Amino acid sequence: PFINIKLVPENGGPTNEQKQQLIEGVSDLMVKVLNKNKASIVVIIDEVDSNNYGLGGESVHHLRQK
Amino acid sequence: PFINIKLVPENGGPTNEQKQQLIEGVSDLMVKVLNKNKASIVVIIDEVDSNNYGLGGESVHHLRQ
Amino acid sequence: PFINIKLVPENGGPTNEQKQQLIEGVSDLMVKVLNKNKASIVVIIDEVDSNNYGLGGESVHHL
Amino acid sequence: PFINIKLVPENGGPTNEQKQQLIEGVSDLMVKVLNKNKASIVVIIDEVDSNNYGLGGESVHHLRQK
Amino acid sequence: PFINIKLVPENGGPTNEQKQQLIEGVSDLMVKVLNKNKASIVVIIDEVDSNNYGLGGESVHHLRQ
Amino acid sequence: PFINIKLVPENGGPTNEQKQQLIEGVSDLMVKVLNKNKASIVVIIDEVDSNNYGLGGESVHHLRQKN
């Protein structure tokens, strides 16, 4: 399986350790819910600049300014 | 955040219930690991034919048989 | 440029005409905001089953 | 709805303001065509290096020289 | 590495055999260029409806009479 | 068509030359197998940090510790 996680950096996060927590976490979910083969699980975390992420028609940067 | 899960169906699954468990599990994981706002977490699960998914150069179809 | 639009179908939407509207709408947006090469714009619309799309931890089907 | 836009930066663009126009425009198009929940609209803009984007078998870094 | 190929079906293609060819093709390409590990190469082929694919602001279905 | 390639950089690579080889390689592959139109082929190569890519539940940074 392939899992793509796209998020916006926040408070110096996520750290390398946190990305690892996500990688292992997401992979374990697939195994627990679908009994998938963890060995073949690929995960990619994309960090999007607050200015390149939009929700509701506004950027995350513009939203955090509130 | 946005999470895209791509997987190959098998054994009549994943059922709609298993899909619900994946959405919940990924969303809770984000909230738990990075204190994300579950309300904004979007998840999309794509199901790929076994003849369309390759690993190591072989199709999942040939790998399962 | 490349634009990927993922949505969950509903009420018989989107029809093939509405998909074309999205393709034209997005393509004209890039040329108007960035003056990008209209002829190099690639758009792909993906229709996601209500049970496969989640928002707030719940599937669109549930919502 | 989710919209991913991948482009190659050019002449200083897109600026944070132009990115907002893309996020706004995209979100308005989804509402005008299918009346989707505007608040649930997620938009991600990825800027690709001109040496990492190909078209017609050639990189954008080269095509811009023609 | 992960490779995603999105295309529009036509005249019955791509066949399961042609999909296999794309998987082996892309996979071998990675090994030859960056000597990447074959076993870790994941390939996903998405087949996009001609009414769902647009180029130059025209759907592939309309761009084919 | 559209081809997205996601890989993790390593040992001074991939260079622009190698990225160009990937663009041409994938493009030729599409032309050879499905006679797809070259001009319409879009390829985007993404370079993922070794800490952002996982396989088997371990980041690539970790996997690369072992030869």
CA angle at F25 for the pair E52 and F45, rounded to the nearest 5°: 60
Question: CB-hemisphere CA count at 13 Å for D42?
Answer: 25
Query: Quick check: do E and A touch, 3+ CB pairs under 8 A?
Result: yes
| Chain F: residue whose CA lies nearest to E40 | F55
**Which residue pairs from D17-24 have beta carbons closer than 8 angstroms and sit at least 24 positions apart in sequence?**
D18/C33, D18/C34, D19/A51, D19/A52, D19/A59, D19/D45, D20/A51, D20/A54, D20/A58, D20/A59, D20/A62, D21/C33, D22/A54, D22/C29, D22/C30, D22/C33, D22/C34, D23/A54, D23/A57, D23/A58, D23/A59, D24/A57, D24/A58
| CATH entry, F1-67, from 3.40.50.2300, 3.30.429.10, 3.40.50.300, 3.30.950.10 | 3.30.429.10
Domain ranges of chain B: 1-65
| Chain D: residue whose CA lies nearest to A51 | D16
Query: Quick check: do F and E touch, 3+ CB pairs under 8 A?
Result: yes
The CATH number assigned to the domain with range A1-66 reads 3.30.429.10
| CATH entry, B1-65, from 3.20.20.70, 3.30.429.10, 3.30.70.1560, 3.30.200.20 | 3.30.429.10
What's E61's DSSP letter? T
d(CA D50, CA D33): 32
CB E8 within 8 A of CB B17: no
Neighbours of D16 (CB within 10 A): 13
d(CA B25, CA B29): 6
Contacts of B56 in chain E (CB under 8 A): 27, 38-41
Token couple for D15: 């600026």
Among A59, C38, C39, smallest CA distance to D18 is for: A59
Token couple for D62: 């080269």
| Known active-site residue D1 | yes
Question: What is the four-CA torsion angle of F31, F36, F42, F45, rounded to 10 degrees?
Answer: -40
In sequence order, what are the residues at sequence separation of 6 or more whose Cβ sits closer than 8 angstroms to the Cβ of residue D61? D49, D50, D51, F16
- Residue C42 at interface with chain F, using a CB cutoff of 8 Å: yes
CATH superfamily of this structure's domain C1-63: Macrophage Migration Inhibitory Factor (3.30.429.10)
| Chain A: residue whose CA lies nearest to B48 | A1
- Residue D13 at interface with chain A, using a CB cutoff of 8 Å: no
d(CA A32, CA B2): 21
Contact between A41 and F56 using a beta-carbon 8 Å cutoff: yes
d(CA E16, CA B36): 41
CB D49 within 8 A of CB D8: yes
Token couple for A24: 């292992």
Method: X-ray
d(CA A54, CA B2): 11
CB D54 within 8 A of CB F41: yes
Q: Which of C16, C21, C40 to mutate to test the interface with E (most CBs of E within 10 A)?
A: C16
Cis ω on the peptide bond leading into residue C9 (within 30° of 0)? no
d(CA D29, CA E40): 39
Kindly tell me the sign of the dihedral angle through the C-alpha atoms of D3, C48, F48, C23. negative
Identity of the residue in D18, D21, D33 whose CB atom sits nearest the CB atom of C21: D33
- Residue D44 at interface with chain B, using a CB cutoff of 8 Å: yes
CB C42 within 8 A of CB C2: yes
Token couple for B48: 């790929």
CB interface of B with D, residues 17-36, below 8 Å: none
Question: What is the four-CA torsion angle of D31, E56, A58, D39, rounded to 10 degrees?
Answer: 30
| Chain F: residue whose CA lies nearest to A40 | F56
Contact between C27 and E61 using a beta-carbon 8 Å cutoff: no
CB B38 within 8 A of CB C56: yes
CB E50 within 8 A of CB E8: yes
Contacts of B26 in chain C (CB under 8 A): 54
Neighbours of chain B (3+ CB pairs under 8 A): A, C, D, E
Token couple for B53: 């998914």
